[PDB]
């Protein structure tokens, strides 16, 4: 619509919630492509912080031969 867009994240990434959701969504996709058990995807949903999201995928990816 011609109206002006409401609040936008153009200013800065001051919004960490959006990044947490995308980080979990992007990490979940990697499990889906590999075809791992849905349990690991569910575990990502409980990831408290992104550092745990990358380390959990990295430890799981490193665990495989």
CSV table of N, CA and C in Angstrom, one decimal:
chain,number,residue,atom,x,y,z
A,1,UNK,N,0.9,-1.2,0.0
A,1,UNK,CA,0.0,0.0,0.0
A,1,UNK,C,0.9,1.2,0.0
A,2,UNK,N,0.4,2.4,-0.4
A,2,UNK,CA,1.2,3.6,-0.5
A,2,UNK,C,1.6,4.0,1.0
A,3,UNK,N,0.8,3.7,1.9
A,3,UNK,CA,1.1,4.0,3.3
A,3,UNK,C,2.6,3.7,3.6
A,4,UNK,N,3.2,4.3,4.7
A,4,UNK,CA,4.6,4.0,5.0
A,4,UNK,C,4.7,2.7,5.8
A,5,UNK,N,5.7,1.9,5.6
A,5,UNK,CA,5.9,0.6,6.3
A,5,UNK,C,6.0,0.9,7.8
A,6,UNK,N,5.4,0.1,8.6
A,6,UNK,CA,5.5,0.4,10.1
A,6,UNK,C,6.9,0.2,10.6
A,7,UNK,N,7.1,-0.2,11.8
A,7,UNK,CA,8.5,-0.4,12.3
A,7,UNK,C,9.3,-1.3,11.4
A,8,UNK,N,10.5,-1.0,11.1
A,8,UNK,CA,11.3,-1.9,10.2
A,8,UNK,C,12.7,-2.2,10.9
A,9,UNK,N,13.3,-3.3,10.5
A,9,UNK,CA,14.6,-3.6,11.1
A,9,UNK,C,15.7,-2.9,10.3
A,10,UNK,N,15.4,-2.0,9.4
A,10,UNK,CA,16.4,-1.4,8.6
A,10,UNK,C,17.4,-0.7,9.5
A,11,UNK,N,17.0,0.0,10.5
A,11,UNK,CA,17.9,0.7,11.4
A,11,UNK,C,19.1,-0.2,11.8
A,12,UNK,N,18.9,-1.3,12.5
A,12,UNK,CA,20.0,-2.2,12.9
A,12,UNK,C,19.4,-3.5,13.3
A,13,UNK,N,20.3,-4.5,13.6
A,13,UNK,CA,19.8,-5.8,14.0
A,13,UNK,C,19.5,-5.8,15.5
A,14,UNK,N,19.2,-4.7,16.1
A,14,UNK,CA,18.9,-4.5,17.5
A,14,UNK,C,17.9,-5.6,17.9
A,15,UNK,N,17.2,-6.2,17.0
A,15,UNK,CA,16.3,-7.3,17.4
A,15,UNK,C,17.0,-8.7,17.3
A,16,UNK,N,17.2,-9.2,18.5
A,16,UNK,CA,17.9,-10.5,18.6
A,16,UNK,C,16.9,-11.7,18.4
A,17,UNK,N,15.7,-11.4,18.7
A,17,UNK,CA,14.6,-12.5,18.6
A,17,UNK,C,14.5,-13.0,17.1
A,18,UNK,N,14.5,-12.0,16.2
A,18,UNK,CA,14.5,-12.4,14.8
A,18,UNK,C,15.7,-13.3,14.4
A,19,UNK,N,16.8,-12.9,14.9
A,19,UNK,CA,18.0,-13.7,14.5
A,19,UNK,C,18.0,-15.1,15.2
A,20,UNK,N,17.5,-15.2,16.4
A,20,UNK,CA,17.4,-16.5,17.1
A,20,UNK,C,16.5,-17.4,16.3
A,21,UNK,N,15.3,-16.9,15.9
A,21,UNK,CA,14.3,-17.7,15.2
A,21,UNK,C,15.0,-18.2,13.8
A,22,UNK,N,15.5,-17.3,13.1
A,22,UNK,CA,16.1,-17.6,11.8
A,22,UNK,C,17.3,-18.6,12.0
A,23,UNK,N,18.1,-18.4,13.0
A,23,UNK,CA,19.2,-19.3,13.3
A,23,UNK,C,18.7,-20.7,13.5
A,24,UNK,N,17.6,-20.8,14.3
A,24,UNK,CA,17.1,-22.2,14.6
A,24,UNK,C,16.4,-22.7,13.3
A,25,UNK,N,15.7,-21.9,12.6
A,25,UNK,CA,15.1,-22.3,11.3
A,25,UNK,C,16.1,-22.8,10.3
A,26,UNK,N,17.2,-22.0,10.1
A,26,UNK,CA,18.2,-22.4,9.2
A,26,UNK,C,18.9,-23.7,9.6
A,27,UNK,N,19.2,-23.8,10.9
A,27,UNK,CA,19.8,-25.0,11.4
A,27,UNK,C,18.9,-26.2,11.2
A,28,UNK,N,17.6,-26.1,11.5
A,28,UNK,CA,16.7,-27.2,11.3
A,28,UNK,C,16.7,-27.7,9.9
A,29,UNK,N,16.8,-26.8,9.0
A,29,UNK,CA,16.8,-27.2,7.5
A,29,UNK,C,18.0,-28.1,7.3
A,30,UNK,N,19.1,-27.9,7.8
A,30,UNK,CA,20.3,-28.8,7.6
A,30,UNK,C,20.0,-30.2,8.1
A,31,UNK,N,19.3,-30.3,9.2
A,31,UNK,CA,18.9,-31.7,9.7
A,31,UNK,C,18.0,-32.3,8.7
A,32,UNK,N,17.0,-31.5,8.3
A,32,UNK,CA,16.0,-32.0,7.3
A,32,UNK,C,16.7,-32.5,6.0
A,33,UNK,N,17.6,-31.8,5.5
A,33,UNK,CA,18.3,-32.3,4.2
A,33,UNK,C,19.0,-33.6,4.5
A,34,UNK,N,19.7,-33.6,5.6
A,34,UNK,CA,20.5,-34.9,6.0
A,34,UNK,C,19.5,-36.0,6.2
A,35,UNK,N,18.4,-35.7,6.9
A,35,UNK,CA,17.4,-36.8,7.2
A,35,UNK,C,17.6,-37.4,8.6
A,36,UNK,N,18.1,-36.6,9.5
A,36,UNK,CA,18.3,-37.1,10.9
A,36,UNK,C,17.0,-37.3,11.6
A,37,UNK,N,17.0,-37.7,12.8
A,37,UNK,CA,15.7,-37.9,13.6
A,37,UNK,C,15.1,-36.6,13.9
A,38,UNK,N,13.8,-36.5,14.0
A,38,UNK,CA,13.1,-35.3,14.3
A,38,UNK,C,13.5,-34.8,15.7
A,39,UNK,N,14.0,-35.7,16.5
A,39,UNK,CA,14.3,-35.3,17.9
A,39,UNK,C,15.4,-34.2,17.9
A,40,UNK,N,16.4,-34.3,17.1
A,40,UNK,CA,17.4,-33.3,17.0
A,40,UNK,C,16.8,-31.9,16.6
A,41,UNK,N,15.9,-31.9,15.7
A,41,UNK,CA,15.3,-30.7,15.3
A,41,UNK,C,14.5,-30.1,16.5
A,42,UNK,N,13.8,-31.0,17.2
A,42,UNK,CA,13.1,-30.5,18.4
A,42,UNK,C,14.1,-30.0,19.4
A,43,UNK,N,15.2,-30.6,19.5
A,43,UNK,CA,16.3,-30.1,20.4
A,43,UNK,C,16.7,-28.6,20.0
A,44,UNK,N,16.8,-28.4,18.8
A,44,UNK,CA,17.1,-27.0,18.3
A,44,UNK,C,16.1,-26.0,18.8
A,45,UNK,N,14.8,-26.4,18.8
A,45,UNK,CA,13.7,-25.6,19.3
A,45,UNK,C,14.0,-25.1,20.7
A,46,UNK,N,14.7,-26.0,21.5
A,46,UNK,CA,15.0,-25.6,22.9
A,46,UNK,C,16.3,-24.9,23.0
A,47,UNK,N,17.0,-24.7,21.9
A,47,UNK,CA,18.4,-24.1,22.0
A,47,UNK,C,18.2,-22.7,22.7
A,48,UNK,N,18.8,-22.5,23.8
A,48,UNK,CA,18.7,-21.3,24.6
A,48,UNK,C,19.4,-20.1,23.8
A,49,UNK,N,20.6,-20.4,23.2
A,49,UNK,CA,21.3,-19.3,22.5
A,49,UNK,C,21.9,-19.8,21.2
A,50,UNK,N,22.2,-18.9,20.3
A,50,UNK,CA,22.8,-19.3,19.0
A,50,UNK,C,24.1,-20.0,19.2
A,51,UNK,N,24.9,-19.6,20.1
A,51,UNK,CA,26.2,-20.3,20.3
A,51,UNK,C,26.0,-21.8,20.5
A,52,UNK,N,24.9,-22.1,21.2
A,52,UNK,CA,24.6,-23.6,21.3
A,52,UNK,C,24.1,-24.1,20.0
A,53,UNK,N,23.4,-23.3,19.2
A,53,UNK,CA,22.8,-23.8,18.0
A,53,UNK,C,24.0,-24.2,17.0
A,54,UNK,N,25.0,-23.4,16.8
A,54,UNK,CA,26.1,-23.8,15.9
A,54,UNK,C,26.9,-24.9,16.5
A,55,UNK,N,27.2,-24.8,17.8
A,55,UNK,CA,28.0,-25.9,18.5
A,55,UNK,C,27.3,-27.2,18.5
A,56,UNK,N,26.0,-27.2,18.7
A,56,UNK,CA,25.2,-28.4,18.7
A,56,UNK,C,25.2,-29.0,17.3
A,57,UNK,N,25.1,-28.2,16.3
A,57,UNK,CA,25.1,-28.7,14.9
A,57,UNK,C,26.5,-29.2,14.6
A,58,UNK,N,27.5,-28.4,15.0
A,58,UNK,CA,28.9,-28.7,14.7
A,58,UNK,C,29.3,-30.0,15.4
A,59,UNK,N,28.9,-30.2,16.6
A,59,UNK,CA,29.3,-31.4,17.4
A,59,UNK,C,28.6,-32.6,16.7
A,60,UNK,N,27.3,-32.4,16.3
A,60,UNK,CA,26.6,-33.5,15.7
A,60,UNK,C,27.2,-33.7,14.3
A,61,UNK,N,27.5,-32.7,13.6
A,61,UNK,CA,28.1,-32.9,12.2
A,61,UNK,C,29.5,-33.5,12.4
A,62,UNK,N,30.2,-33.1,13.4
A,62,UNK,CA,31.6,-33.7,13.6
A,62,UNK,C,31.4,-35.1,14.1
A,63,UNK,N,30.4,-35.4,14.8
A,63,UNK,CA,30.2,-36.8,15.3
A,63,UNK,C,30.1,-37.8,14.1
A,64,UNK,N,29.4,-37.4,13.1
A,64,UNK,CA,29.3,-38.3,11.9
A,64,UNK,C,30.7,-38.5,11.3
A,65,UNK,N,31.0,-39.7,10.7
A,65,UNK,CA,32.4,-39.9,10.1
A,65,UNK,C,32.6,-39.0,8.9
